Nucleic acid binder design. Structure first.
Length: 156
RNA sequence: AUGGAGAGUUUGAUCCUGGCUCAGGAUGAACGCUGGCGGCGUGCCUAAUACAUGCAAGUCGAGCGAACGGACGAGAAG
């Protein structure tokens, strides 16, 4: 699994002595073949935080439906105030996405997509919104099975 | 399906709300520095301010009278 460090944040807890600092890492994990995960890890040192995040991301991996390097249908993934619109694109379009979304889509093995972050730009909520969208993605075969029709009948 | 990227900044730290700021494209542009050439364009946006000088509306003799020019070529031998 490829691993990309989306953000590293120095967080502080106030004690009598003063502020105690730890580092938080947000990491996306993917095989670049329809499985992607995200995890957060916190530690006094950044390498240890990254490592914990990688282990967390591997624990939660989501299967993404892909139609020839794009998504099956347009979707708006929403989590909290985070909102990400993702529209399927033709080959050679490239990944048109910003910041956290790019990492998630690339590691999921999506090479062509149109995306816009419509909500919060906070990295974690953008990632969760993106994952939500991918989770609500559906494939024609499953829709056909659920609706008791052939894929051809689905499209008429 | 031919088409859609975000970032910084309120806190000890946080999530949110929210404004501010930036990365792009464009111009009858101006200014600074610099400057080889060619092709094709563009060039008073302001004082519908005032304007020296030349030029930008004439033509027709197959409408007309008249005037000039007087060829060709009429006479005398100084």
């Amino acid at each position: 699994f490829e691993e990309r460090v989306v953000t590293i944040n120095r967080v502080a807890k106030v004690v009598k002595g003063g502020r105690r600092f730890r580092f938080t890492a947000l990491v996306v994990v993917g095989d670049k073949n329809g499985r992607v995960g995200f995890g957060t890890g916190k530690a006094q040192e950044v390498p240890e935080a990254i490592k914990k995040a990688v282990e967390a991301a591997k624990k939660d991996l989501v299967v993404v439906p892909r139609v020839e390097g794009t998504t099956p249908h347009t979707i708006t993934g929403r989590y909290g105030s985070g909102s990400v619109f993702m529209k399927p694109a033709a080959p050679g379009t490239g990944v048109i996405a910003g910041g956290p979304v790019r990492a998630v889509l690339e590691l999921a093995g999506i090479t062509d997509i149109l995306s816009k972050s419509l909500g919060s730009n906070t990295p974690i909520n953008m990632v969760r919104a993106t994952i939500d969208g991918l989770q609500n993605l559906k494939n024609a075969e499953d829709v056909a099975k659920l609706r008791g029709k052939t894929v051809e009948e689905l499209y008429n």
